[PDB]
Amino acid sequence: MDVFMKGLSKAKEGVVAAAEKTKQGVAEAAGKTKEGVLYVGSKTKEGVVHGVATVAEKTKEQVTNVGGAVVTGVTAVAQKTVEGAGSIAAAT
């Protein structure tokens, strides 16, 4: 309710909640090595000028369904920029 402590209690659980995220992060991107010092027929220098230019298929097709969900942040903001307009009856 207090202007931002609504999001300064909810953020505390992108800190309770989204904690278990980069915790994995650290927890899990530290052993590249393991199979590193090993050799796999999955990279032969067309899985670079190909095996790189096809991880577009899954990363490409996030934003059909995040058509809205990186734009529903272009939903909820400039209606505080109308708690700007009604406020410069007051502010100024």
């Binding site: 278990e20 995220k21 994995q24 899990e28 991107a29 199979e35 796999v40 999955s42």
Partner: protein, 187 residues
């Protein structure tokens, strides 16, 4: 604190579409319950692989809720899911609590049977398109994996890994999925 998955295993289920997601999800640190639709009894799958559930769906339901409900395919498997009042209850409630529902191959047809996620973009096995599109309650997709909100669908045994990793990504994030993927030697 682990994410949790319920995999509903019916007689005639495609065993590859069952085992691949269970395995892959377990690799991701998901607590998976393989729940036997008609009890704790061993389940004969489409190609006679016999899988012992962790419990009955009855009992598994009591330990819920789950972050994802997974429907394997197989013609008979999917028919069995489609006929179950218990499954209907679980899917309705999962949709309600804004939980993920993932279905592969013929699996999505159970969504239709229980009036789940109407209006969603879906894929199915090519063979199952006809049945799924009966009534025009979905838009059809040719993508190997389709995710439209909390409805995640996929096409067949050959898309099982992609399906499973999409679930991992949904529950545990991109980085975890990538980690799990690495040693699978996928193409």
């Amino acid at each position: 604190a682990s994410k949790r998955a319920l995999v509903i295993l019916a007689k005639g289920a495609e065993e590859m579409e069952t085992v691949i997601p269970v395995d892959v999800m377990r690799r991701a640190g998901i607590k998976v319950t393989v729940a036997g639709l008609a009890g704790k009894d061993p389940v004969q799958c489409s190609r006679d692989v016999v899988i012992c559930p962790d419990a009955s769906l009855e009992d598994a339901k009591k330990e819920g809720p789950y972050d994802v409900v997974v429907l394997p395919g197989g013609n008979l498997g999917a028919q069995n899911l489609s006929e179950s009042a218990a499954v209907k209850e679980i899917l309705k409630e999962q949709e309600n609590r804004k939980g993920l529902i993932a279905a592969i191959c013929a699996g999505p047809t159970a969504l239709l049977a229980h009036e789940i996620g109407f209006g969603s973009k879906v894929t199915t096995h090519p063979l199952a398109k006809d049945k799924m599109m009966n009534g025009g309650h979905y838009t059809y997709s040719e993508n190997r994996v389709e995710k439209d909100g909390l409805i995640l669908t996929s096409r067949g045994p050959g898309t099982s890994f992609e399906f499973a990793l999409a679930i991992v990504e949904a529950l545990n994030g991109k980085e975890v999925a990538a980690q799990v993927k690495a040693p699978l030697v996928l193409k």
